[PDB]
Swiss-Prot record, chain A:
The chain holds residues 687 to 1257 of 1314 of the full protein. This is SWI/SNF chromatin-remodeling complex subunit SWI1. Keywords: Activator, Amyloid, DNA-binding, Metal-binding, Nucleus, Prion, Transcription, Transcription regulation, Zinc, Zinc-finger. The gene is SWI1. GO terms for molecular function: RNA polymerase II-specific DNA-binding transcription factor binding; transcription cis-regulatory region binding; zinc ion binding. Transmembrane segments: none annotated. The prion domain (PrD) is a Gln/Asn (Q/N)-rich domain, which is unstructured in its native, soluble form, and which forms a parallel in-register beta-sheet in its amyloid form. The first 37 residues of this domain are sufficient for aggregation, propagation, and transmission of the [SWI+] prion. A zinc finger (C4-type) spans 423-439. One of its GO terms (biological process) is positive regulation of mating type switching. It comes from Saccharomyces cerevisiae (strain ATCC 204508 / S288c). It comes from the Eukaryota. GO terms for cellular component: chromatin; nucleus; SWI/SNF complex. Involved in transcriptional activation. Component of the SWI/SNF complex, an ATP-dependent chromatin remodeling complex, which is required for the positive and negative regulation of gene expression of a large number of genes. It changes chromatin structure by altering DNA-histone contacts within a nucleosome, leading eventually to a change in nucleosome position, thus facilitating or repressing binding of gene-specific transcription factors. Belongs to the SWI1 family.
Swiss-Prot record, chain F:
Present with 3180 molecules/cell in log phase SD medium. It comes from the Eukaryota. Interacts with SWI3 and SNF12. Component of the SWI/SNF global transcription activator complex. The 1.14 MDa SWI/SNF complex is composed of 11 different subunits: one copy each of SWI1, SNF2/SWI2, SNF5, SNF12/SWP73, ARP7/SWP61, ARP9/SWP59; two copies each of SWI3, SNF6, SNF11, SWP82; and three copies of TAF14/SWP29. It is found in: Nucleus. Involved in transcriptional activation. Component of the SWI/SNF complex, an ATP-dependent chromatin remodeling complex, which is required for the positive and negative regulation of gene expression of a large number of genes. It changes chromatin structure by altering DNA-histone contacts within a nucleosome, leading eventually to a change in nucleosome position, thus facilitating or repressing binding of gene-specific transcription factors. This is SWI/SNF global transcription activator complex subunit SWP82. Belongs to the RSC7/SWP82 family. SWP82 subfamily. It comes from Saccharomyces cerevisiae (strain ATCC 204508 / S288c).
From Swiss-Prot, chain I:
Present with 3150 molecules/cell in log phase SD medium. Interacts with RTT102, SWP82 and the N-terminus of SNF2. Component of the SWI/SNF global transcription activator complex. The 1.14 MDa SWI/SNF complex is composed of 11 different subunits: one copy each of SWI1, SNF2/SWI2, SNF5, SNF12/SWP73, ARP7/SWP61, ARP9/SWP59; two copies each of SWI3, SNF6, SNF11, SWP82; and three copies of TAF14/SWP29. It is found in: Nucleus. Coiled coil: none annotated. Signal peptide: none annotated. The chain holds residues 390 to 437 of 825 of the full protein. This is SWI/SNF complex subunit SWI3. Involved in transcriptional activation. Component of the SWI/SNF complex, an ATP-dependent chromatin-remodeling complex, which is required for the positive and negative regulation of gene expression of a large number of genes. It changes chromatin structure by altering DNA-histone contacts within a nucleosome, leading eventually to a change in nucleosome position, thus facilitating or repressing binding of gene-specific transcription factors. It comes from Saccharomyces cerevisiae (strain ATCC 204508 / S288c) (Baker's yeast).
Curated annotation (Swiss-Prot), chain J:
Present with 3150 molecules/cell in log phase SD medium. Interacts with RTT102, SWP82 and the N-terminus of SNF2. Component of the SWI/SNF global transcription activator complex. The 1.14 MDa SWI/SNF complex is composed of 11 different subunits: one copy each of SWI1, SNF2/SWI2, SNF5, SNF12/SWP73, ARP7/SWP61, ARP9/SWP59; two copies each of SWI3, SNF6, SNF11, SWP82; and three copies of TAF14/SWP29. Involved in transcriptional activation. Component of the SWI/SNF complex, an ATP-dependent chromatin-remodeling complex, which is required for the positive and negative regulation of gene expression of a large number of genes. It changes chromatin structure by altering DNA-histone contacts within a nucleosome, leading eventually to a change in nucleosome position, thus facilitating or repressing binding of gene-specific transcription factors. It is found in: Nucleus. The chain holds residues 587 to 631 of 825 of the full protein. The gene is SWI3. It comes from Saccharomyces cerevisiae (strain ATCC 204508 / S288c) (Baker's yeast). This is SWI/SNF complex subunit SWI3. Transmembrane segments: none annotated.
């Protein structure tokens, strides 16, 4: 242990000297393995540090590089290809041509097209190998148990190393890229720039698809969980300006966000309390939803269409995925989303014992109420089940909790006046929707 | 003409080789490698590129501009602008225009040439040394 | 076989050791199979003046 | 005896005279790859270094052409104890001889 | 069975066999009743066996570089930290706005 | 224009290099763009002894 | 006066997006997992 | 007793010696960091990094530098999607001959140049091109910032009045053209010399390429590239005037 | 059928700067690109 | 050279032989109820 702590593996921040963003970008754009790995390690050590600002305003192309690199890697990972040490080469007037072609024809008898290619590869889901058979909706606690079981095995492959297996190398490069994006998303200018970047959103879509639909190519369960954590943290820092590009992205974002809850075992609420000390990654999902719903443009229209029910390929894939999720088994996704949002409000914990806890939890309560209110007022006739009534009579009695929260706030710090009104509004709207749905 | 100066390129431009075209050049300047315009072929590309590089490396101290290339080779100025920017971006030209001298280093122990030992640990370097078995039955 | 390999690798990792297997890299097949890697590395080491 | 017949690496791009010049030039100049290259002539330094690294000098003295070395294969780290765990070391030596399919058949018959 | 002494014996035997074959090459060189083919083969085998340790050194150099190229901090330092933060009041104010 | 004196033959090349020495002696301080005055120096391998 | 709006946005975002550190940042398992101790236990 | 022994005590002796070596190595690494903090340049076990060239000098305290200016300019960064969009849908190469002439007893600066510009080009903005050009002529900052607008307007006008080649926009292309032949007269003053010439040129034929003709003439008279581009531009200019 | 006999090196050619293809170049490398190395290895056969 | 690494196993010369292989075999088969051994293989009496 001491030897490992003193060994010269890589530089730490105080000895990187002057860091050059242009040189790191050009290193990433070359196709040399050592250049890429050195650039990645330097970027990780820099971005993970405090007192060191990576300003993308002064050199934006850097971001593109990273994203583009990631995309190609994902492709190579899905089709079982290895990009390094290819054993290939890697290199490469009409009158005059008429004349010398006549010359060639004469000498041969004597001896007796436009190119097209794209900058990026086709996404990741139109590939004939990537067709959905199953959605992997493993919860968070079960994922932690799997990670513990795979590390505590005698014949564990957790330390194969990068020079002994190329798939481990591709996975390590992808993990580093994701950590770097997560680290640099923590600033105003970088977040504003990252919200509108075209390559970043395509990379996010590809990684979401590969993590949720075809996760067999990753070598570790911990790497899958870390990809998910990085995704929710980036989206949480960025979604206040994000415009979604497809409906499949909205579906995958919903699945990713609700995967961080605790399901029980439809007619009742399908999620449990998900305590407080167990995790805090659920708050990021609540925050992502509250901000994404804010845009009554492409994002709201997509979510409405998904929750209530190349473009041809997208329609076929959407139908396939919805049938895979729900298998009168309709609106299971609505029920799951709203039950997740309700389970995020720590009712039993705050009501059991009171001012300090609500002071510490007012942001997540505020945004959970905002999202539930948007769903109830704006999204909600193909229904065959009185949904708001099964939310009202759910055996957990959330209405009583909302009313008790309102009362506790009354007898009692900038959000409370909004939380009172949200609580009472939500109760009233749920009751009225119950009656109208029954009609 | 003998080499009169020293020529430095960044380590990530190691792929570049005259009398050869790499995939990076094809991916970055696609206009020359689609057979859509008859005045933009790989032969013309190599012509222009080698002209620029040869003409720069005769005096590395001076900035090689786009106006001189535009004036000495014939073509539309836009494609020449794009090629000049690609080149000056990947190193390969203008890399040593206003160069500076490295002052002098103070060398702590183990940061110097000929600083290696027989008794030092062999961290990497996979070849190991074994204890010779000198014992009467083993002998 | 798996048990023996895993025990030896655990000892190696707990000692803070890394590197290639010595028996694999003393043989000539390893260098006629990894031809491309060796070429690229040799060029990179030479052109920088490290060889 | 066993002879390290080096001059049979005549693989097409190299030749007996090329190999002779390579070996004698490395013997003259230790690791001056440019002087060795110009000694050989017609070949670049990098080809000389590649051919030098690929020469099979030691291979005939090593254990096998490729059974196996067994435990000895992990030479620097050998977690075996003759005194305390006598069965595992013997079995580590023995697993090389046997055919595993007959072992599976026999244990299934036993069960 | 003692495996440590077995590996020691294996390595020492390798060394001794190298030395005997070098001696035999010197022998075939030092007498003139051998042909020209035998003498040339002996001389160049002597050269190769004398260059063996330099080959080991250069191979080790290249393999060091190659092992270093494939190394990433996420593999060696699995507990590397990142930039988590908490959802706060400003997020809620911004959403309302 | 390239800085070579004039009409150099294939036989005079090394003398030209020697001339370079004279060039700085005839003060003048050489640049890093000067033959033999690179900022980057070779870092010898461990098997080279010296 | 669009620069004043930008200064206000900067002041707001520096407080909002600031990362926590060496504090309540408390991590779950799968972050505070010692590989060395598990390797020793399994040995 | 050998440190290359397997027993138990030799293995742990080897581990202790390795640990001591790595501890003193870490001591020298801290020495290097401290010495470089006090603005005394010190060598490092990782080398010098980038030396004084492009990419600047590593081995300073610690910074994040977006880039190092080359020739007092910033690197050009373009949109690759637009690049591929233009490159994959291209059909023709309509070329405009552009002439710049500014006197001093007029707008304050004096400058003369000839140029060819592709009109079917949507990638490069004339303002960037002109700014770069004025940097190439080593104009002061003030003069450049003053006159870039005038030069850009001058260049932008000539592109708009270039309707094009008639025999192409109106499909004629008779493989020999008609016989409309004109006299093309040259007067080019590159250097201390002046080339004067005159030759017949047919403007109905779309096979006549001025670049190849100028290149051939300048090979046969041993002239530098300045004459080549000047002759090509002059041919194109007079053909378009007609 | 035209200029077949003319000696090469008498044919016209472009007036261009000479070629710089046979030049030696040095590479500027970043900091963590090469590992740190100890252990100067033998380089000589052991006495037996 | 059928037995690969057994060549290098040390042994005292000329006196006091020890049998690792046969001892291990007799120990491991001495635990398994001779009837199912007779059923396992035909080599056993």
């Amino acid at each position: 242990e001491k030897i490992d702590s003193n060994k010269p593996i890589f530089l730490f921040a105080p000895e990187l000297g002057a860091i050059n963003l242009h040189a790191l970008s050009m290193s990433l754009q070359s196709k040399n393995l050592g250049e890429i790995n050195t650039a990645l390690n330097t970027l990780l050590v820099t971005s993970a540090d405090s007192n060191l600002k990576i300003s993308l305003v002064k050199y934006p192309e850097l971001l593109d590089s990273l994203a583009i690199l990631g995309m190609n890697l994902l492709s190579n990972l899905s089709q079982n290809v290895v990009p390094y040490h290819r054993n290939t080469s890697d290199y490469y007037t009409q009158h005059d041509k008429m004349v010398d072609k006549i010359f060639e024809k004469v000498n041969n008898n004597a001896t007796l097209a436009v190119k097209q290619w794209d900058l990026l590869p086709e996404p990741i889901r139109f590939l004939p190998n990537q067709f959905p058979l199953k959605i992997h909706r493993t919860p968070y606690l079960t994922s932690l148990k799997k990670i513990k079981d795979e590390i505590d095995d005698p014949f564990t492959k957790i330390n194969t190393r990068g020079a002994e297996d190329p798939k481990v190398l591709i996975n390590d490069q992808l993990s580093t890229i994701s950590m770097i994006l997560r680290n640099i998303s923590f600033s105003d200018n970088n977040s504003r720039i990252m919200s509108r970047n075209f390559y970043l959103k395509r990379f996010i879509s590809d990684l979401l698809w590969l993590v949720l639909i075809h996760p067999e190519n990753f070598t570790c369960n911990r790497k899958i969980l870390n990809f998910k954590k990085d995704l929710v943290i980036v989206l949480s820092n960025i979604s206040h300006l994000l415009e979604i590009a497809s409906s499949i992205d909205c579906l995958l974002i919903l699945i990713l966000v609700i995967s961080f809850g605790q399901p029980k075992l439809s007619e009742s609420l399908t999620f449990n309390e998900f305590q407080l000390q167990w995790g805090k990654y659920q708050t990021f999902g609540v925050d992502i939803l509250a901000k994404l719903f804010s845009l009554e443009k492409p994002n709201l229209n997509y979510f409405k269409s998904i929750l209530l029910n190349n473009n041809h390929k997208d329609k076929k894939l959407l139908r396939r995925l919805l049938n895979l999720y729900n298998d009168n088994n309709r609106h299971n996704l609505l029920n799951d989303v709203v039950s997740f949002l309700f389970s995020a409000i720590p009712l039993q914990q705050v009501l059991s014992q009171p001012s300090l806890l609500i002071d510490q939890f007012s942001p997540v309560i505020s945004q959970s109420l905002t999202s539930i209110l948007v769903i109830v007022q704006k999204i909600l006739f193909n229904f065959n089940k009185n949904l708001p009534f099964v939310w009202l009579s759910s055996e957990e009695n959330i209405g009583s909790g909302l009313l008790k929260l309102s009362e506790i706030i009354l007898n009692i710090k900038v959000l409370l006046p909004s939380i009172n009104i949200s609580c009472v509004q939500l109760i009233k709207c749920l009751v009225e929707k119950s009656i109208c749905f029954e009609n | 003409i003998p080499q009169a100066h020293e020529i430095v390129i960044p380590s990530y431009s190691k792929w570049f080789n005259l009398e050869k075209i790499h995939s990076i050049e094809v991916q970055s300047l696609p206009e020359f490698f689609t057979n859509r315009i008859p005045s933009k072929t790989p032969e013309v590309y190599m012509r222009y590129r080698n002209f620029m590089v040869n003409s720069y490396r005769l005096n590395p101290n001076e900035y090689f501009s786009v106006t001189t290339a535009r004036r000495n080779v014939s073509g539309d100025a836009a494609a020449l602008f794009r090629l000049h920017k690609f080149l000056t971006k990947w190193g390969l030209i203008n890399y040593q225009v206003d160069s500076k001298l490295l002052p002098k280093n103070i060398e702590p122990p183990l940061t110097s040439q000929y600083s290696t030992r027989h008794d030092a640990p062999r961290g990497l370097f996979p070849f190991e040394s074994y204890k010779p078995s000198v014992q009467l039955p083993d002998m | 076989n798996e048990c023996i390999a895993s025990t030896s690798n655990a000892l190696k990792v707990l000692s803070g050791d890394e590197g290639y297997n010595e028996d694999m890299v003393r043989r000539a097949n390893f260098y006629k199979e990894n031809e491309a890697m060796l070429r690229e590395n040799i060029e990179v080491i030479l052109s920088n003046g490290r060889m | 005896l066993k002879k390290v017949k080096i001059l049979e690496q005549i693989d097409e791009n190299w030749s007996k005279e090329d190999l002779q010049k390579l070996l004698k030039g490395i013997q003259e100049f230790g690791a001056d790859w440019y002087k060795v290259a110009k000694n050989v002539g017609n070949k670049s330094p990098e080809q000389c270094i590649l051919r030098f690294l690929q020469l099979p000098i030691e291979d005939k003295f090593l254990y096998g052409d490729g059974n196996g070395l067994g435990p000895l294969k992990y030479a620097p780290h050998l977690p075996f104890s003759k005194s305390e765990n006598p069965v595992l070391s013997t079995i580590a030596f023995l697993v090389g001889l046997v055919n595993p399919k007959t072992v599976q058949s026999m244990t299934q018959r036993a069960i | 069975i003692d495996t440590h002494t077995a590996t020691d014996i294996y390595q020492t035997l390798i060394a001794l066999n190298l030395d005997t074959t070098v001696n035999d090459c010197l022998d075939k060189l030092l007498n003139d009743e051998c042909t020209e083919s035998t003498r040339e083969n002996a001389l160049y085998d002597y050269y190769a066996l004398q260059l063996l340790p330099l080959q080991k050194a250069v191979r080790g150099h290249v393999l060091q570089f190659e092992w270093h190229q494939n190394s990433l901090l996420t593999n060696t330092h699995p507990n590397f930290l990142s930039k988590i933060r908490n959802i706060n009041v400003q997020d809620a104010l911004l959403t309302n706005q | 224009k390239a800085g070579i004196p004039i009409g150099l033959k294939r036989s005079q090349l090394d003398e030209f290099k020697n001339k370079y020495l004279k060039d700085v002696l005839a003060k003048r301080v050489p640049n890093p763009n000067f033959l033999g005055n690179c900022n980057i120096k070779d870092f010898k391998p461990p098997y080279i002894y010296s | 006066a669009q620069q004043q709006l930008n200064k206000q946005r900067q002041d707001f975002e520096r407080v909002r997006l600031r990362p926590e550190q060496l504090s309540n940042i408390i991590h779950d398992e799968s972050d505070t997992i010692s590989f060395r101790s598990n390797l020793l236990k399994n040995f | 007793f050998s440190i290359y022994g397997f027993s138990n005590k030799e293995y742990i002796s080897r581990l202790w010696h390795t640990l001591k070596y790595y501890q003193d190595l870490k001591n020298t690494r801290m020495k290097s960091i401290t010495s470089t903090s006090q603005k005394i340049p010190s060598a490092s076990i990782w080398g010098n990094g980038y030396s004084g060239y492009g990419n600047g000098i590593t081995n300073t305290t610690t910074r994040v530098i977006p880039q190092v200016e080359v020739g007092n300019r910033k690197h050009y960064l373009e949109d690759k999607l637009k690049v591929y969009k233009q490159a994959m849908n291209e059909t023709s190469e309509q070329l405009v001959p552009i002439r710049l002439e500014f006197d001093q007893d007029r707008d304050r600066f004096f400058l003369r140049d000839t140029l060819l510009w592709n009109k079917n080009d949507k990638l490069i903005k004339i303002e960037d091109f002109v700014d770069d050009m004025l940097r190439d002529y080593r104009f002061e900052d003030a003069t450049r910032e003053q006159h870039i607008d005038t030069i850009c307007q001058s260049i932008q006008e000539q592109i708009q009045e270039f309707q094009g080649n008639p025999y192409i926009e109106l499909n004629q292309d008779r493989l020999g053209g008609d016989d409309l032949r004109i006299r093309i007269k040259l007067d080019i003053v590159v250097g201390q010399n002046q080339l004067i010439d005159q030759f017949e040129w047919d403007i109905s034929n779309s096979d006549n390429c001025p670049e190849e003709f100028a290149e051939s003439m300048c090979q046969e008279l041993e002239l530098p590239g300045e004459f080549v581009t000047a002759i090509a531009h002059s041919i194109r200019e007079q053909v378009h005037m007609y």
